[PDB]
Each structure stands twice: as C-alpha cells, then as structure tokens.
Amino acid sequence: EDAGLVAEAEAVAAGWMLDFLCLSLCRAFRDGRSEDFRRTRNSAEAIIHGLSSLTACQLRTIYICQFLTRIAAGKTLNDERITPLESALMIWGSIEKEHDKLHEEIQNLIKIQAIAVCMENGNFKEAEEVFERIFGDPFKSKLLMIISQKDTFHSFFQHFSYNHMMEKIKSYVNYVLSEKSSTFLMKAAAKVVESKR
Amino acid sequence: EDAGLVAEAEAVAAGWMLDFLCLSLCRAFRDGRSEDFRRTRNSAEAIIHGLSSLTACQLRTIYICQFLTRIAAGKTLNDERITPLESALMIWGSIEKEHDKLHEEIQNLIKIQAIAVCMENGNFKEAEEVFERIFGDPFKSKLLMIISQKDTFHSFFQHFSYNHMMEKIKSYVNYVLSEKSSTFLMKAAAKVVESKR
Ligand SMILES: Cn1cc(C(F)(F)F)nc1[C@H]1CCCNC1
Numbered sequence: 001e002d003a004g005l006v007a008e009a010e011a012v013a014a015g016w017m018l019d020f021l022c023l024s025l026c027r028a029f030r031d032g033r034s035e036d037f038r039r040t041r042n043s044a045e046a047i048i049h050g051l052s053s054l055t056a057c058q059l060r061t062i063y064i065c066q067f068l069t070r071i072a073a074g075k076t077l078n079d080e081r082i083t084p085l086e087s088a089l090m091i092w093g094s095i096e097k098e099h100d101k102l103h104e105e106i107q108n109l110i111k112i113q114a115i116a117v118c119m120e121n122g123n124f125k126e127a128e129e130v131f132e133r134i135f136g137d138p139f140k141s142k143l144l145m146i147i148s149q150k151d152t153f154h155s156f157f158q159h160f161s162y163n164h165m166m167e168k169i170k171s172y173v174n175y176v177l178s179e180k181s182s183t184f185l186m187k188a189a190a191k192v193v194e195s196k197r
Numbered sequence: 198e199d200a201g202l203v204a205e206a207e208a209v210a211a212g213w214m215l216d217f218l219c220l221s222l223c224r225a226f227r228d229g230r231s232e233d234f235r236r237t238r239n240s241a242e243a244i245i246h247g248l249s250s251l252t253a254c255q256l257r258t259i260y261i262c263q264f265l266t267r268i269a270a271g272k273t274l275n276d277e278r279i280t281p282l283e284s285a286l287m288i289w290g291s292i293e294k295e296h297d298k299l300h301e302e303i304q305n306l307i308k309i310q311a312i313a314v315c316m317e318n319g320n321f322k323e324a325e326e327v328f329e330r331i332f333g334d335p336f337k338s339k340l341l342m343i344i345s346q347k348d349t350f351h352s353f354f355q356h357f358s359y360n361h362m363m364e365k366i367k368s369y370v371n372y373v374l375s376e377k378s379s380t381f382l383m384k385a386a387a388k389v390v391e392s393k394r
C-alpha cells in the first residue's frame with residue numbers, strides 16, 4: 001500500500017466533504033433550521049481541522065461558513081470581547097470576493113445592526129463600545145446621536161433592520177448555493193435519490 | 198426545490214462520509230498515527246450526530262470506531278468510573294459480528310490487559326476493582342493470585358501482553374479495512390489520484 005497515494009485520496013475526499021458541508025450550511029441558514037446549522041457547522045469545523053493546507057477556493061469556503069456562523073449568532077450577546085456581528089464584519093471584508101453594490105449593502109447593514117442589537121437588548125454601554133470600534137476616525141454623525149439619546153426605535157433602524165440585513169445576506173447565500181450546487185458529493189448523492197424514485 | 202429530496206441526498210452523503218471516516222480511522226489506528234486518529238475520530242463523531250437514524254450496517258461501523266477509540270486510550274487511566282479497556286470489552290461483545298476464534302482471542306486479551314495496565318501504572322486497588330467488575334461469579338483463579346501478590350511481571354502477562362492484544366486487534370482492523378476499501382467515497386477519491394499520476 002502506498003501511504004502517500006492514500007493520504008492524497010483522503011485530501012481529495014476532505015475537499016469534497018468541505019464543499020458538501022458548506023452547501024448544507026447555506027441551505028440550513030436559508031431554511032431557518034437552527035439545529036441542522038449547528039450540527040453541520042460542527043461537522044465542517046472537524047473536516048477543516050483534518051486538512052493541513054487549504055487552497056484559495058477552500059479558504060473562501062471556510063470563510064463563508066465562519067461568516068454565516070457569526071450572523072446566525074448575531075442576536076446572542078468566547079475568546080474575544082468583540083460582538084458576533086463585529087466579527088462577521090471582519091470576515092466579510094476579508095473574504096476574497098468582488099466588492100459590488102450587494103457587498104457594500106451587506107457591510108453597512110451589518111455595521112448598523114451591530115449597534116442596534118445591543119440597544120434592543122438594553123446594552124447601551126455596549127452599543128457605545130461597538131460604535132467606537134466600528135467608527136473610530138458616512139452614518140457616524142446620525143448613529144452617535146441615536147445611541148446618545150438611546151432612541152432604539154429610530155426610523156433609521158426600521159429601514160436598516162435585522163430582516164433587511166438578513167434578506168441581503170440570504171440573497172448572497174443563494175448565489176453561493178447555486179455555485180456549489182454542482183459539487184461532486186451533492187451531485188453524486190442527488191443522482192442516487194433520483195435512481196430510487 | 199424539494200426539501201425532502203435534498204435531505205435524502207444529504208443522508209446518502211452522510212453515510213458515504215461515515216464509511217470513509219471509518220476507513221481513515223482504521224488506517225490511522227494500524228499506522229500508529231495518533232493525531233490523525235484523534236482528528237478523524239472528531240470528524241466521525243460530528244458526522245454521526247448529523248444522522249437522525251442509522252441502519253444495522255451503520256451501527257456496526259460506529260461501534261467499530263468507538264471500540265478503536267477505547268483501545269487507543271487503553272493505557273490512559275470521563276462520564277463513568279469504568280476503564281477504557283473495560284469499555285472496549287462492552288463494545289466488543291455487543292458489535293453484531295461472528296464470535297469466531299479471533300473474537301474470543303481479542304476478548305480474553307482485553308480482559309487480561311484491563312487488569313495488567315492498572316498494575317503497570319502502580320494502581321493495584323484499581324486492578325482489584327477492574328477484576329471484580331470483569332469476573333464477578335477461566336483465568337480468574339490465576340488473575341486473583343497475580344493481583345493479590347502484586348506480581349506485575351508474571352509470565353502469564355508476558356504471553357497475553359499489550360502487543361499480543363494490539364496485534365490481534367490490528368489483524369481484525371485489516372479485515373474491516375479490506376471490506377470498506379471498496380466504499381464509494383474512498384474509491385472515487387483514489388480514482389482522481391491515479392488520473393493525475
Ligand atoms: C476554523 N473554523 C472553521 C469553521 C467553520 F465555520 F466550521 F467553517 N469555524 C472555525 C473556527 C473559527 C474561530 C472560532 N471557532 C470556529
């Protein structure tokens with residue numbers, strides 16, 4: 001047995017499992033299946049840990065899974081003092097993707113919602129700390145005012161709402177879902193199902 | 198999109214990942230790759246948690262993975278007071294397999310080694326507690342004597358040694374390895390490697 005050619009096959013299968021788990025994480029996120037998302041995320045992290053080295057494509061995949069995990073935990077709320085949406089905002093800006101009108105839309109919605117979710121939980125000191133971390137040198141003039149006067153139900157927040165953020169993210173998720181829908185593992189699995197029907 | 202036919206495909210792929218991870222756990226166990234075994238075991242447990250229901254074949258697979266994890270931790274040495282080899286002995290007796298001459302050989306070696314590893318760590322009280330749990334109503338007359346006189350280097354233990362146990366287990370592992378070597382995921386992965394060479 002050639003240990004090298006066996007490890008090479010294990011690496012090909014690890015990459016195949018990663019793409020399938022990303023696709024399952026995207027669908028669970030879109031479908032609102034919380035427990036399924038939690039279980040699939042655990043499987044993806046374990047598969048990723050087995051891989052010693054990742055390609056640029058695989059890095060993009062794991063970063064999407066990490067971004068979705070953070071968005072899923074936004075209203076919850078580890079190793080750092082930053083909030084889950086602030087953490088999603090760092091991932092979002094570092095994913096190797098085109099910075100189109102949808103990228104900026106999601107980015108500003110996450111920035112706004114990182115503050116709004118603190119205010120809605122009654123954490124006004126945290127909203128102030130999140131604000132200074134996100135804006136420390138376009139909407140800063142308005143947000144500082146809203147946070148200062150503790151106006152949780154300002155009309156600005158009703159336009160840039162959690163649902164508005166969640167819909168823009170869910171439409172980004174649908175593009176990733178169409179791109180990876182043709183990956184090896186899911187395509188081979190769907191073929192088996194159709195053979196039984 | 199038919200949510201039912203998507204979940205069906207996800208279940209087919211989960212079963213495919215389980216067989217591949219079992220095969221990778223068997224090879225890592227046989228190869229002495231401790232860290233690889235640890236990482237693959239973590240991946241297998243996460244995949245198993247995603248599956249709501251398992252077939253008899255899949256139950257046999259997870260039980261082999263659990264048995265190997267326990268054997269790997271035998272000289273270490275959670276939720277119970279039983280030792281890892283005592284736990285391997287419960288799995289061994291409940292795996293749906295033929296009780297051949299190799300089954301009884303592995304069983305008696307595990308029974309003997311569950312006591313011997315306690316004595317070798319200087320845990321003579323634990324060796325006595327393990328003995329009464331394993332024998333509480335063939336070698337009991339001899340083992341009680343060896344444990345009573347704290348004879349860690351008795352010739353009985355040199356015949357039924359950790360290596361003797363480990364070799365019989367490694368030859369069982371090789372039969373499982375030949376049986377699952379033809380599973381979908383590993384066979385498809387190996388085909389890709391040969392296409393590149
Ligand atoms: C490394 N990694 C991969 C993933 C996954 F989302 F599953 F893709 N998640 C993590 C880590 C990132 C830091 C916090 N803990 C989890």
Ligand SMILES: Cn1cc(C(F)(F)F)nc1[C@H]1CCCNC1
Nearest residue numbers: 238239241242245259262263266
């Ligand atoms: C359920 N399960 C599956 C496996 C695996 F070995 F990965 F196959 N291990 C467990 C559990 C068994 C009880 C102790 N903790 C781990």
